[PDB]
Amino acid sequence: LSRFVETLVVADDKMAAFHGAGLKRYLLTVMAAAAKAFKHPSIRNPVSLVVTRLVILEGPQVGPSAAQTLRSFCAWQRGLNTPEDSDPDHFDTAILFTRQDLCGVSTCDTLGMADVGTVCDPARSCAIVEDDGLQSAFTAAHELGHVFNMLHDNSKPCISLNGPLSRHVMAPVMAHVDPEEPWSPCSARFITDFLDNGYGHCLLDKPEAPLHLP
Ligand SMILES: O=C1NC(=O)[C@](CNC(=O)c2cc3cc(Cl)ccc3o2)(c2nccs2)N1
Ligand SMILES: [Ca+2]
Ligand SMILES: [Ca+2]
Ligand SMILES: [Ca+2]
Ligand SMILES: [Zn+2]
């Protein structure tokens, strides 16, 4: 029942250049806020996002293309992991924060990208986030929602699960998130199905040494 995502957090050289000595505290603050969203009852099946490893940056190729940056990061992070979840150095997902302005095919409006429904596949359990300096925890929550198999709330399946009456984490673009319902019914259904179907089998072990905000 209790689920734990052992998370590797990675910050690129641009993050280090900007945030400097306060970077570690900043990343843990961002991740604490994302973790709070994943415990909210609206998600139906809460999970504990636990930072277990923190890397401040050869490394991954970071550039304008969100797609290519994600692929490069996901290839790179594989090398840091271990084969077995029982090894304390093993992690369940990897998230990169960058100051790079990430882009799609026609615009640079995107703030992140992730593989969908990949949380317990070490080869694919990856997300990237463009650090905007204020709302990065919401972007991280959106990308981790995708990692947990969530769709956007304007997708056809979500229409039928959400009802007729853009205020949630899995909105297709960032808008003001409802504090009483960060996750739509569609998001709750998709993460619940995902875990019920056995795709969260790597989330059952408790981490030994979480990184805590002191
Ligand atoms: O993860 C992604 N889904 C996408 O459609 C997008 C763009 N959206 C965001 O960056 C983004 C961040 C965010 C935060 C909240 Cl609270 C709600 C919605 C949000 O959307 C891409 N477009 C093209 C390639 S990737 N990235
Ligand atoms: Ca483990
Ligand atoms: Ca961008
Ligand atoms: Ca695990
Ligand atoms: Zn999305």
Cross-strand partners of 112 = 129
Can you tell me the distance from the alpha carbon of 206 to that of 44, in angstroms, rounded to the nearest whole number? 20
CATH of the domain at 213: 3.40.390.10
Residue 15 has φ and ψ, to the nearest 5°, of -60, -45
Assess whether the C-beta atom of 168 lies below 6 angstroms from ligand 1.
no
User: Per the residue annotation, which of 143, 180, 181, 208 is the catalytic one?
Assistant: 143
Identify which of 108, 80, 107, 105 has the alpha carbon closest to the alpha carbon of residue 94.
80
Q: In what order do the strands lie in the sheet with 93-98?
A: 48-56, 4-11, 93-98, 126-130, 112-114
- Residue numbers of the domain that contains 121: 1-214
Can you tell me the distance from the alpha carbon of 72 to that of 94, in angstroms, rounded to the nearest whole number? 12
Does 143 participate in catalysis according to the annotation?
Answer: yes
Q: Find the ligand nearest to 98 CA.
A: 3
Hunting for tokens 């910050």 — which residue is that?
Answer: 11
The response to whether 142 counts as a known ligand-binding position is yes
- Amino acid at the residue 172: P
CB neighbour class for 17 (10 Å; exposed up to 12, middle 13-18, buried from 19):
exposed
User: How many angstroms separate the Cα of 5 from the Cα of each of 48, 95, 114?
Assistant: 6, 12, 16
Give CA angle at 145 (78, 111), nearest 5°.
80
Residue of 135, 142, 149, 186 with the most ligand 1 atoms within 8 Å of its CB, for mutation: 142
Q: How many CB atoms lie within 10 A of CB 29?
A: 14
Q: Find the ligand nearest to 139 CA.
A: 1
Question: Which atom number of ligand 1 is nearest to the Cα of residue 143?
Answer: 1
The response to whether 168 counts as a known ligand-binding position is no
DSSP string of the chain?
---EEEEEEEE-HHHHHHHGGGHHHHHHHHHHHHHHHHHSGGGSS--EEEEEEEEE-------SBHHHHHHHHHHHHHTT--S-TTSTT--SEEEEEE-S--B-SS-S---EEE-SS-TT-TTT-EEEEE--SSSHHHHHHHHHHHHTTPPPTTSHHHHHHH-----STTSSS--PPPTT-SS-HHHHHHHHHHHHTTTTGGG-SPPSS-----
Could you give the number of structural domains in the chain? Answer: 1
Give CA angle at 144 (191, 203), nearest 5°.
60
Q: Ligand 2 centroid to 121 CA: how many Å?
A: 13
Identify which of 210, 180, 194 has the alpha carbon closest to the alpha carbon of residue 150.
194
- Where residue 149 falls (left for φ over 0; alpha for ψ -120 to 50; beta otherwise) is left
Assess whether the C-beta atom of 112 lies below 6 angstroms from ligand 1.
yes
Q: What is the resolution of this structure in A?
A: 1.6
The radius of gyration of the chain's CA atoms, rounded to the nearest angstrom, is 16
Q: Ligand 1 centroid to 214 CA: how many Å?
A: 31
Six token digits for residue 153 = 């709330």
Q: Which residues surround ligand 3, an ion (CB under 5 A)?
A: 101-102, 108
Q: Ligand 1 centroid to 103 CA: how many Å?
A: 11
